[PDB]
Amino acid sequence: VSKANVPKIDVSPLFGDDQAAKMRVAQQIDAASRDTGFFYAVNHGINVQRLSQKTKEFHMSITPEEKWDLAIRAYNKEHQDQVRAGYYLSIPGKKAVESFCYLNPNFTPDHPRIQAKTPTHEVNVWPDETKHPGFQDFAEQYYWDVFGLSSALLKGYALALGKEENFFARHFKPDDTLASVVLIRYPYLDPYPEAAIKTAADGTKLSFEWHEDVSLITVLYQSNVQNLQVETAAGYQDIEADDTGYLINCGSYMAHLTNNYYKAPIHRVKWVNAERQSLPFFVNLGYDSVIDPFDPREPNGKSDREPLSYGDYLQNGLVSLINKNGQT
């Protein structure tokens, strides 16, 4: 099994005002997006040491009582309004992974999309502050930190495609973004439950099957345990781990609006019996955001693809992924 070419790109010029340096970053984003579809963002300015430590303290401290109280509707029939946000329980002996998902901290009972009961908008649920001091403060702060990095990355993607730098970022707003953070724990278990291991067609043991992401882009921090593979025409290739950088890839909304010029790479998660963390940020736009598709391959950029509202795209995509790859 070969290793994927995943370049490390210094994204720090995207926070600055040297326009030529920004173009040089854009070229590297373009090149990576047209090859395997993955790159590492380095020199990003986020304290990922604190991110991993605070996430670890939470996963290891939370009790079954608290998990039921935070559980999404798939695990707790009483929580009909928690489809996305909350705790995704493991099932001892059956399901190893567990995770906590939260949404835009600005979605409050007072927020107009919450008042209108608009699908995919939810109010976050949090553990008790006395049992997990500082956890909510940390997590909300982290959302805005990775929002900022993601904004900058979106300027690079715009420039790479020949657009003005706010082409995507103008739709990525703190008041209405549907972006989510998921804090995923993959545990060490001995014996490891066989029901939690999937066998791929090629024989590889997996934790999560092939998929394209439901996102515009995905901005991922993982601890230093190799697990991801990306599909190429010549088969799956291993993505090397790097626990100082963020792993970036496009989701299927980018593939839609570029007429597949930037594909959403198909990837899967190998089974590895090791304690590790996977902390994705899914860059989603607003419910009513619409970007007119274009084809960068054509001089006039003409595309026949229908514009797709981000809210409709997200509603269909999240359900489809659950149906295909299982309730996480």
Ligand SMILES: [Fe+2]
């Ligand atoms: Fe993914």
